Amino acid sequence: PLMVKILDAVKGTPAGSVALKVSQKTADGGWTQIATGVTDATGEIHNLITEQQFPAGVYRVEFDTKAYWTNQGSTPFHEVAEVVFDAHPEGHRHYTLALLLSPFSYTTTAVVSSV
Amino acid sequence: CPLMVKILDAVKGTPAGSVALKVSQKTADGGWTQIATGVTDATGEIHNLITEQQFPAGVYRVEFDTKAYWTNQGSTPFHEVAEVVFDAHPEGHRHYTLALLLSPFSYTTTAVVSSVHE
Amino acid sequence: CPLMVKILDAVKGTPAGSVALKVSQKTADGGWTQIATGVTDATGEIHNLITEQQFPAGVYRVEFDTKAYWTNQGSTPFHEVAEVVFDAHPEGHRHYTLALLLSPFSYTTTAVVS
Amino acid sequence: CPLMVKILDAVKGTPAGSVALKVSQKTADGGWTQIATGVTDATGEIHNLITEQQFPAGVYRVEFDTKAYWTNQGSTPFHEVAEVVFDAHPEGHRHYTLALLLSPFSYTTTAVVSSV
């Protein structure tokens, strides 16, 4: 239900080996970690979480973009890239977090399916 | 397919369906010749736009009718068209995906030339 | 003005006015301390957000309340908030401009460091 | 000034200096006529590109030589050129700023319309 697609805007290829963590907002406004992972060579993470593990609520996906740029030989601006959103996964609704990376800029977009 | 597109609507958070586009190749005299037309499906893609034979190295222009798209959505668009002009290097089984992120007053054109990082 | 913002609305093609934001600084023990808050003017900027005195080297977080912006515009947005997190080296009259381009289901954050 | 540009380099985190551009206006037969050329300064801008008299309503094309820009940076660009094509409506003292965010394999073109 949650997918990601990370692209490297310098190389024109997906951003491989990007570390990320998924957190779910708690009642008191805190966070609980539900999953971690690293993108494969296609800039994706398969079976990141499951349907039951992804109920309605506010989620935060943290992408370790600083490490990605360091490993590519660039010095980036951002310490991390965070994507924070309300999820309503009732039925079919799947979420794709697309992320386009440059050393001093990123674009975060979402593709949300209907039912 | 050597040339794919992926168009997204940043207002709705869905792929941009029914976006018309045309692909042209720059000729020897400096002009443009149209080699394909198409319209995106509901996934924001166009399958089998052109074949390998139709896509030798050269300069290509892909023109997307974004103005009509936004007009149909009931919005007010800025651009008359979105144009993506590039020198194609298909050698070494290199395939192109033209990603386009649309907002009425903005678009982002990105190219993906490998399915994997390196 | 060593920390500036420029917020644009990609739907309307105008700066995004009245966007609430807050600036925090990372502290010794890893938490965050809020050092300023503001609301963008009609030009999508906030003048005199912080002073050089308030902006020593360190990690900073600028949180933009984009959800409220879209709700007010009549749009149903994706993000709860837009967060920009970065290490700052202002120690030298070094200017930071955080440019933010907003759409209901997308934003672009870029930095111009002078 | 009715037509301004602002170009940023998303790799370096600075404005993109020395970017060559050409402004053309669409003619009645669907052709183009060149009305101005220029190169961005260190702030990624071009002052006094055209006058209000030279900018009536109509379709304009601004062509940015991004390929040369990236080639000169020692990078490998995707795009052969960046073109921004739009119908200008400057009536009621509306001015345009063409913002352009450049990366070797991606760019973002946005417009800011202001009553200045």
Side-chain angles (χ1 to χ4, degrees):
Chain A
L2 193 53
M3 291 161 64
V4 306
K5 188 60 167 181
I6 311 180
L7 294 186
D8 178 321
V10 170
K11 302 286 201 72
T13 77
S17 297
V18 177
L20 68 77
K21 53 214 306 271
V22 186
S23 292
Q24 172 192 60
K25 206 173 206 178
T26 65
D28 56 317
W31 299 98
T32 186
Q33 178 177 291
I34 62 161
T36 68
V38 172
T39 54
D40 58 26
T42 71
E44 310 180 13
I45 298 181
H46 298 98
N47 323 336
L48 182 49
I49 64 174
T50 53
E51 299 84 6
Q52 271 305 352
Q53 213 179 354
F54 193 58
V58 167
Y59 290 79
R60 173 183 69 196
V61 179
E62 290 194 24
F63 300 87
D64 190 354
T65 56
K66 193 185 178 178
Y68 173 79
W69 288 116
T70 308
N71 199 33
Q72 218 91 177
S74 301
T75 49
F77 176 68
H78 300 92
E79 188 78 27
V80 63
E82 295 160 327
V83 177
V84 180
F85 64 101
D86 299 328
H88 303 116
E90 296 86 33
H92 302 293
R93 199 174 300 291
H94 284 157
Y95 290 75
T96 297
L97 306 187
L99 182 68
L100 180 67
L101 306 180
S102 301
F104 274 67
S105 177
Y106 62 85
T107 294
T108 159
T109 181
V111 181
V112 186
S113 70
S114 57
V115 284
Chain B
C1 296
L3 181 61
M4 299 170 262
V5 310
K6 183 68 179 191
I7 312 185
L8 297 184
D9 178 324
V11 169
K12 278 162 45 171
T14 67
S18 296
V19 179
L21 66 78
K22 67 188 224 306
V23 178
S24 303
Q25 186 182 354
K26 198 184 212 188
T27 62
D29 51 28
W32 296 91
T33 192
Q34 177 178 298
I35 60 166
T37 61
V39 178
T40 57
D41 62 25
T43 72
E45 310 179 10
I46 296 186
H47 300 181
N48 293 296
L49 195 49
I50 57 173
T51 66
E52 279 182 32
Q53 282 282 7
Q54 277 175 292
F55 200 57
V59 179
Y60 294 77
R61 192 254 295 313
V62 183
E63 185 167 304
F64 302 83
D65 191 354
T66 55
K67 183 187 187 181
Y69 180 80
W70 289 118
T71 297
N72 181 259
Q73 294 287 299
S75 209
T76 293
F78 170 72
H79 300 93
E80 273 299 275
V81 57
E83 253 156 52
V84 179
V85 189
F86 65 109
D87 303 331
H89 311 127
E91 74 273 12
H93 51 82
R94 170 187 289 108
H95 313 97
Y96 288 83
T97 296
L98 272 26
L100 192 59
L101 175 61
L102 307 176
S103 300
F105 261 64
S106 187
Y107 68 79
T108 295
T109 157
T110 304
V112 179
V113 294
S114 174
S115 61
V116 293
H117 178 287
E118 258 341 35
Chain C
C1 295
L3 185 54
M4 287 169 289
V5 306
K6 184 55 168 203
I7 314 185
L8 301 181
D9 179 322
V11 168
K12 283 175 168 163
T14 73
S18 300
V19 174
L21 64 79
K22 76 187 226 105
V23 183
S24 299
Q25 180 177 28
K26 200 176 189 169
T27 60
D29 64 35
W32 295 96
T33 194
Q34 182 185 289
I35 57 169
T37 70
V39 172
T40 57
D41 58 33
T43 76
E45 303 178 20
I46 294 184
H47 301 111
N48 307 129
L49 181 52
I50 55 169
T51 60
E52 297 210 346
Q53 191 174 14
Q54 297 180 285
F55 202 49
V59 176
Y60 290 82
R61 177 177 82 190
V62 177
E63 191 165 279
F64 301 88
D65 185 356
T66 54
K67 186 176 187 178
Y69 177 77
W70 288 113
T71 301
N72 178 266
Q73 289 288 314
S75 296
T76 284
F78 175 71
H79 304 91
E80 275 286 326
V81 67
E83 288 261 273
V84 179
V85 186
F86 70 100
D87 221 306
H89 316 279
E91 319 262 279
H93 301 292
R94 177 109 67 177
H95 281 179
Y96 286 79
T97 298
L98 277 31
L100 184 64
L101 179 65
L102 306 180
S103 304
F105 274 63
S106 191
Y107 63 80
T108 295
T109 155
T110 315
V112 176
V113 181
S114 160
Chain D
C1 205
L3 186 56
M4 288 156 292
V5 307
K6 184 67 172 186
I7 317 186
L8 303 177
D9 178 324
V11 171
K12 287 194 158 56
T14 63
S18 297
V19 179
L21 60 79
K22 176 163 44 148
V23 184
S24 297
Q25 185 180 3
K26 197 158 174 168
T27 61
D29 78 335
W32 298 99
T33 183
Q34 174 175 298
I35 62 173
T37 68
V39 183
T40 54
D41 59 29
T43 74
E45 312 183 4
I46 296 183
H47 291 171
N48 302 118
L49 192 49
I50 53 174
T51 64
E52 279 173 4
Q53 186 165 205
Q54 302 172 293
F55 197 63
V59 172
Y60 293 81
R61 176 185 66 192
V62 179
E63 288 172 299
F64 298 86
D65 193 352
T66 54
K67 188 176 182 185
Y69 182 74
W70 288 117
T71 296
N72 189 59
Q73 296 288 125
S75 316
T76 290
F78 169 67
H79 300 95
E80 186 75 353
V81 62
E83 293 161 332
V84 179
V85 188
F86 66 104
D87 195 15
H89 311 122
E91 67 268 20
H93 49 84
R94 266 53 187 177
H95 291 2
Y96 288 81
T97 297
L98 303 190
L100 195 62
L101 180 61
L102 306 176
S103 300
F105 265 61
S106 186
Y107 64 80
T108 294
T109 157
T110 203
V112 183
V113 178
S114 52
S115 64
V116 306

